[model samples]
Target: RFLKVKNWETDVVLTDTLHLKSTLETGCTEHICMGSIMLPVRTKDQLFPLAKEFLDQYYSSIKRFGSKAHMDRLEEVNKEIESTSTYQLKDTELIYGAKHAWRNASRCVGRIQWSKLQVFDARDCTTAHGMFNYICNHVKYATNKGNLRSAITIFPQRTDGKHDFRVWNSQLIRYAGYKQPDGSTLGDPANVQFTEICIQQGWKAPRGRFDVLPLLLQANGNDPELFQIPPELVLEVPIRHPKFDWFKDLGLKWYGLPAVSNMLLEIGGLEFSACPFSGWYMGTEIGVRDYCDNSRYNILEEVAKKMDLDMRKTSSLWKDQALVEINIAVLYSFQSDKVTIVDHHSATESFIKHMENEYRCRGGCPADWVWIVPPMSGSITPVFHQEMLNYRLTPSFEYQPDPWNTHVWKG
Candidate 1:
């Protein structure tokens, strides 16, 4: 009857009581039935665990089936998730975190640790079984040791009791109900769900912050499991050495670029797609300097705030260096497209933004730093000059140093 009336058909539907409550709570309005409608066969309390079990069973079934039909079903599930407008967390939060996670995975393409799942104990305290399944599904394909390690450390902390079955159920329900048939409505619900969990669990909500689950999941918050990394295969030197700790996030800390590249090739693997602009050396000299001096860059300050480390007397290894050079290196395959902005470009931009606001209004304004932008050209299949855009329209220093030679000094 419905199909005859308007030529519309329902392909998939999620209906449950908890979802009903969530829809009404989040979408109730003066005149509109802003919420969606569906029917499920379970009570409110039963709905959560049952839905979680369904997700778990469905994922496992897909894994075991290994058929085109199974793959299609998997894609269908992902599409549903992608199309959902309402969820517990905001779209920005989900997108940003998920983007980084996905990038981290893609960056190590063809590598051994090419995975997506990461498991952590609640508040770095107690381990949860749910985390095991989460890690198993998301990270089974990872290729790099560092990628796997960091994913485990960061994500475990993100997947605390706050991510229990009940919570997941509530989020799934909200996601299904907070949309119109046309697939448009008031922003996503995932962010709201995530934020709600944060506040209810008594975690401090830092702007642009996402790792609050661990702090709120369990009372004790100093377990080593929270920081555990899988044992590294190469023990010749400390590939996990602290000097290059910050570079881990940038996907360059595991040995220098050359060593990482060689290892991947020798192992017959592909390098993960790097973040666009997140390489270590693209931002302002002053900003780079802040990686060392807390008083100067405030990056140390930001880290301290997140980790609760006291910054009154804290400092980074790069602090107060007489000379340091900022280098942006791009390594690409010959077959790569010329017009595309690879992941490294995006990584660089993210690093620049992180450095800028992090250091703005701190010791001797960043305006004093000499800014340099250069065009980079490389061989391989597509050789083209990449124009360097000034992060900000106005160069910081009035008397700009030679764009190429300003910071390199010989004493």
Candidate 2:
């Protein structure tokens, strides 16, 4: 018979389990059955192999200056894992592991400063309320009054093999997308599904284009908690052109920091689903992708018309001219506000330096050519001329399933 098992991680009793006979017959051996609830079953047999593969590469670099004591300790840990089914890492190890993960992330062009990432330890937070508090702290500290810092706030790892902590929002600073009465979206189209879920869970929807969404945090096995972001803590940039007087009247604006909260941070085989990381904005990310994408704002035609460009002629390069001006406006706005932002030209140059540094230090660098090339000024950037190779590397951040799809809400 299936039983209700009390989860020690979240303080919730979960009823999601299969009967012993049914579980055995179906060969469902991946999850460990503890009473009635199912837990992710990861033995040393599954973990240590990957751990050795990753740790081996790490130790090789340190071995030149390291002593035998460190090597002996790793061997002892391996032996302990052989007897027990698990091994634990020290806090220092976890911090370094997270940094390594960032350095190994192939799609990221900002890995040169991966060693400078600030990692927060929130391993003791078992309740959703506690998780919310940490997230608030993360946002406040990372924002740093327009001078954004790259940081990651890590939550508790899955230790009991049952419960996982996660944040539902894609980014810590996301605008709420409200569906209008006429079947149109008022705010960001990317967050419509998330906004709908939040409203369904009793969050009051705000009616502004740039209203920051609240935090939706799930800890252990409890229902997700929604916490509103403090208005004073958020830094916003008002968009206006350097030359055009009509641009400011358009009333375009955006948040300063892009703190991604949905991706899973994997370090030494352990996954921290609630680890949110942030970096300062790259201008094209706002100007090209967010504003100009057809599925998103799609403002190229409107801006072109305002500039009196010939929209009827495809050869007029109206879209191209409008895109450049929009990007210029974004860079100008951020600089005008004293907010930290990078232009595509400068960012690509930094990426080239990052690649060179990585190649010299790590023998090779892994990069995705499509992502490394900026959306605008593609041919002019040095990265566009360089070929790139993409491959999976452990101790990296990865996309996870949306919480709306996986969460089992309580009444």
Candidate 3:
């Protein structure tokens, strides 16, 4: 006689009784299971005993992290089973298989730590470095892991002893220069000047020359090195419109259109241009972060690749200069007389379609397009052209195609 080989399937069920209690406390759903496998007559009882022991061991791990660790972990377990095991429970089965498990701490670590936090107001004198550290630390803590737009709300004391502070909505903050207008020295060096204005307004002191000059001085950083201006000796010149605005105004005479012409004239008076790519829109680059030097066009490069839109071909008019190219592209779509209705509509439609496709592919959208602005080319220039209005009818759409319909407009 020969010993015969036996064939059998193994199944294990795990549960945590501790987690069951916590789950009940946390209001999680409960579940139970019962199953048996046929085996050789001699081994059947032995297998049953072994299966029970294994299940008990598995249930012990489930008891950790309270019954409700998070729905994320629970979903992960179910998803793994569904994808990996045929006989294993599907998510629905896991949902029904769940038993009393762990209990999680109700409080999250997201709460603000008031002790280590520094407070500043109108009464307290703060160093520029201290203020920078405070803003950086608070913002860093808020946005450290995955949070975006975590901001500090600073308040100053009023004359009546009431707390007075306002929330900063814009990420860009302005600093006052140390100098004053009329080339005259201030009566008091420590008096409320530009730097004091920054403190009173709860704005950070201008860290880099580019921010102070363009944002504070309203001058483009293209002319001279601003870092050469000593912090204490810096002068606060009378804020005037950037030179580009003036140039744009002078240049707009070439483009013939009433609305476009009129808007350019109006732009000369406005302090900032609304264009997303304008220097004033995002403000000038600050500090040695090298922010202004880097181009955001790489993002557009990725977008162009997916859409089968060749940046080299579509941007032939732009040459190698990405910023001017992108700006001209917008002008091409909107103002170019050469662009037909179909061309304009299709370009807009393609953009929307690309976004929708990306969302579907990625399962969700991570970012949103607020406005279209060409990337920064020079170092630490204003994000918007304050005088973009002067270029309002600058005839940037010279590449526009001829009219589609020769038929006259009917009255």
Query: Would you list the C-alpha lDDT of every candidate in the order shown?
Result: 0.24, 0.77, 0.23
Report the lDDT tens digits of candidate 1 across residue range 1-411: 011111012222211121111111323357865233221011233333322333343344336455665455445544543454111222222223333332222112111222232322222323433333333332232223222232222222122222211111111111111223574422222334444444444544443322212211111122111111122322111112123343234322112111110010000011111111111112222223323242222333333343344445536422222112112211121112121122333433343333233233211101101111112212211101211111111100011111112122121
Candidate 3 lDDT by residue in tens digits, 1-411 = 111111111121112222222111221125621111111011222332332332333344455332343344444544543453211222322221111000011111111121122222211313333333343344343333321222221211111111111111112222323445675322212222434434443445444322332111101111111121222322112211222222222111111110000000001011111000001111111110111132211223432343344466754523334333333333332233321112222333333333234234422211111121122333122211111100011101111111111112221
Q: How does residue 352 of candidate 3 score in lDDT?
A: 35
Error of 3 at 401 (Å): 44
TM-score of 2: 0.85
Clash count per candidate: 53, 0, 28
Candidate with the greatest TM-score versus the true structure: 2
Model 3 misplaced stretches (Cα beyond 4 Å) = 1-67, 71-132, 136-169, 172-362, 366-411
lDDT of 1 at 232: 36
lDDT of 2 by residue, 1-411 (tens): 434433233343333122221101211245852222221145676777666655665676567224575566578668877877556667777787788778867678777678899988888799988988887888888889988888888898765545778888999888888788898888888888898888988998867887788888889856788998888888899999999999998889999998998888776667778888888989999999999988777789889989999999989999999999999999999999889999888887787777666655554555667677788888887777765544456677777788767767675
- Superposed by TM-score, candidate 3 places the C-alpha of residue 383 at a distance from the truth, in angstroms, of 20
